[PDB]
Amino acid sequence: APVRSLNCTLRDSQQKSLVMSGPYELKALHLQGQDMEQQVVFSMSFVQGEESNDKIPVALGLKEKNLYLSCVLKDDKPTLQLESVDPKNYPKKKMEKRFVFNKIEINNKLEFESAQFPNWYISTSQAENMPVFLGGTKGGQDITDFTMQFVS
C-alpha cells in the first residue's frame, strides 16, 4: 500500500525548536509564542528497515517540500544534509538508506540514529542558533535526545 506518514515537530531535550533558516539549513533555538510558527514541520514516514519494539525506521521529510534529512560522507565524515528529491517519487516505503533513521524510544525521549552510520545521531549544540548535525556519540555536551509533538 502507500507509505504511512505523520506530521510532527521535534524539540531537543533542552527544549530548543528547529527552524529552516537558510537554503538547506536547519537551526535549533529557544522559541515561544508568535515565533513558534517559524518551526519546521516534518512529515515522518514509516519506512522499510530492521525494526524492534523501541527502534522504528523512519524518514524525515519537510512537510509539503521535496526535501529529506539524509546522512552522507562529506569531506570524509558522516554528515547530516537536507537533500532534494523528485517529488513524483517520494515519499516511498523503500527509502534509500541515507534517508533512514532508527527512531529509538529511551526513558520517554527519542533519539534518531543514522541507519547508514551506526551510532551517529541527529544532534544539536547547547548554544542557540547553531546547525543541526550528525554527531558520532549519544554521550557528552551535544544533545541527542528529542521529544515529538504531533501536528494536524
Ligand X SMILES: O=C(CC(F)(F)F)N1CCNCC1
Instruction: Calculate ∠ Cα 91-118-102, nearest 5°.
Output: 40
Work out whether 25 is an interface residue with ligand X (CB under 6 A). Answer: yes
Work out whether 66 is an interface residue with ligand X (CB under 6 A). Answer: no
Toward ligand X, which CB reaches closer, 22 or 33?
22
- Residues 66, 26: Cα–Cα separation, whole Å: 15
- Cis peptide bond N-terminal to 78, omega within 30: no
Taking the complex as a whole, how short is the minimal distance between the CB of residue 87 and ligand X, in angstroms? 18
Q: CA quadruple 13, 105, 149, 17: dihedral positive or negative?
A: positive
C-alpha cell at 10: 521535534
> Which class for 14: exposed (0-12), middle (13-18), buried (19 or more C-beta within 10 A)?
middle
Segment 120 to 149, residues that bind ligand X, using CB under 6 A: 131-132
- Encoded amino acid at 65, one letter: K
Toward ligand X, which CB reaches closer, 70 or 102?
70
Work out whether 69 is an interface residue with ligand X (CB under 6 A). Answer: yes
Work out whether 40 is an interface residue with ligand X (CB under 6 A). Answer: no
Of 4, 6, 24, 129, the one binding ligand X by CB under 6 A: 24
Work out whether 82 is an interface residue with ligand X (CB under 6 A). Answer: yes
Work out whether 13 is an interface residue with ligand X (CB under 6 A). Answer: no
Of 26, 40, 47, 115, the one binding ligand X by CB under 6 A: 26
- Residues 98, 87: Cα–Cα separation, whole Å: 17
Of 81, 97, 136, 142, the one binding ligand X by CB under 6 A: 81
Residues in contact with ligand X by the rule CB under 6 A: 24-26, 69, 80-82, 131-132
